[PDB]
Design a protein around this ligand. Sequence first.
Ligand SMILES: [Ca+2]
Length: 279
Amino acid sequence: AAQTNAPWGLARISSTSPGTSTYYYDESAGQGSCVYVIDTGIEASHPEFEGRAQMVKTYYYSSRDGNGHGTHCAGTVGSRTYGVAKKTQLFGVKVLDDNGSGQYSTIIAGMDFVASDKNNRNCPKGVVASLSLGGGYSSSVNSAAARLQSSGVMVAVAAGNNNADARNYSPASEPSVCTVGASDRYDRRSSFSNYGSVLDIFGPGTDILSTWIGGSTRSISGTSMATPHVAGLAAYLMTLGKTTAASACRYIADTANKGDLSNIPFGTVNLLAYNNYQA
Ligand SMILES: [Ca+2]
């Protein structure tokens, strides 16, 4: 399948090269997989989700995304225009209030929630979780990411936005999950991407068009926007049969565009997520 005049990041993760605007992907498109967006919530009523999205948890007084962040990230995963994995089932978990703030202990509670709940859902092709959030190093926050991953969920986490080595941030520094940095449409590291040997992979994160609340769209920027490209990609690769929840971060790295970003500091991977469909 081909989707012309696509947001640049969907074209990128289907290209070897920058500078084009079609998104090339196999039509199975994540059918039979499940992606949990653990964030401010998802405006499931957005027609771009077409009935595939459900809130299933909150730790606040409403499950609605009253911020926009969770809806943007979820759209990149799996909205019909703006998503990677256009036939995946989306499940929301609201661990952030309507300003973007979550206490750690609640974020932990969300995370163990997914390791349990996946067992209430129909996900024959595999389960992913997408965490576009974080704060300073915590062993506990990190332990809750290793548990979620260990429970057979592909876990994808934002490296962080301080232009700093990510080993000081959580859940990014955790080893066993898939820590995602960001890039721009000219294959530069985005100016705000944390870096450091704990990163596994980079994704489009600067000027990412996606869904927003009210039924609407916007372009925003962050390792948060990069993260759901890799989550959606992993859902897409499960569904096909290329990899598994426990093998997908390795698998994406093995198949990435290798050398191609500017400004990988020394010691940071220079790997860019790629679906290997067109070549
Ligand atoms: Ca890893």
